[PDB]
């Protein structure tokens, strides 16, 4: 996923500006702010993921 973010970040910008290159896909996609909940801390504060 680090390599896929590196591709979509800064080798997809010079690649598609060249001549002749049509549409294309990459394996995976860019990053995402993945937030990891845990149920013990949600119990400890009287919280729910909603």
């Amino acid at each position: 996923e680090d390599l896929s973010n590196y591709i979509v970040s800064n080798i997809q910008d010079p690649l598609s500006r060249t001549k002749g290159v049509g549409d294309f896909q990459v394996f995976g996609s860019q990053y995402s702010m993945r937030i990891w909940l845990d149920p013990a801390k949600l119990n400890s504060y009287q919280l729910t993921p909603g």
Partner: protein, 52 residues
């Protein structure tokens, strides 16, 4: 501002010397004894004015 503890062995990297890379970690560029630039991963707790 509560005050607690002293660390007698602490290192204060400057703010200009450490820069977040594209993942989210903190990386600082160091040199070796063989005079070649190497990257080292940093974790940083506090800020004191202008230093990490």
């Amino acid at each position: 501002q509560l005050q607690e503890g002293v660390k007698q062995k602490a290192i204060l990297a400057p703010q200009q010397g450490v820069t977040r890379d594209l993942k989210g970690q903190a990386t600082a560029l160091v040199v070796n004894a063989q005079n070649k630039v190497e990257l080292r991963v940093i974790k940083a707790d506090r800020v004191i004015g202008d230093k990490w």
